[PDB]
Swiss-Prot record:
Name of the protein in question: Endoplasmic reticulum resident protein 29
GO cellular component terms listed in the entry, alphabetical order: cell surface; endoplasmic reticulum; endoplasmic reticulum lumen; melanosome; smooth endoplasmic reticulum
UniProt note on tissues of expression: Ubiquitous. Mostly expressed in secretory tissues.
Stated induction or repression of this protein's expression: By stress.
Top-level lineage group: Eukaryota
Assembly behavior: Homodimer. Part of a large chaperone multiprotein complex comprising CABP1, DNAJB11, HSP90B1, HSPA5, HYOU, PDIA2, PDIA4, PPIB, SDF2L1, UGGT1 and very small amounts of ERP29, but not, or at very low levels, CALR nor CANX.
GO molecular function, one term: protein-folding chaperone binding
Function comment: Does not seem to be a disulfide isomerase. Plays an important role in the processing of secretory proteins within the endoplasmic reticulum (ER), possibly by participating in the folding of proteins in the ER.
Motif (Prevents secretion from ER): 103-106
One Gene Ontology term from the biological process aspect of the record: positive regulation of gene expression
Keyword Endoplasmic reticulum (UniProt): yes
Primary subcellular site in the record, as a coarse category: endoplasmic reticulum
């Protein structure tokens, strides 16, 4: 598993922004930054941006719920092939946790 430090930076800038317009601007930067993202890396960059689109309205509550979902799936009877995807999901979702906030077991 891994992450996109480029979009982790954007995630920070996004979720910590009290301005909806500022949030959208940060998302756009990621959307435009795709021009410098590898075809493999785009598989994660897409997730970052989609999550941002939801957080815009829902706040950090959204990825927080998703983290709970992914965590449960890991404990659940999933096939090995899915374990990598679940771990990757946690990293991307975690990036959208408000700075300084308590981190839950994943």
């Amino acid at each position: 598993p891994g992450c996109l430090p480029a979009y982790d930076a954007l995630a920070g800038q996004f979720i910590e922004a009290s301005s909806r317009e500022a949030r959208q601007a940060i998302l756009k930067q990621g959307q435009d930054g795709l021009s410098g993202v590898k075809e493999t890396d785009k598989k994660w960059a897409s997730q970052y941006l989609k999550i941002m689109g939801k957080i815009l309205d829902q706040g950090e509550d959204f990825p927080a719920s998703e983290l709970a979902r992914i965590s449960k799936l890991i404990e659940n009877k999933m096939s090995e092939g899915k374990k990598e995807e679940l771990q990757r999901s946690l990293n991307i979702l975690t990036a959208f946790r408000k700075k300084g906030a308590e981190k839950e077991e994943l």
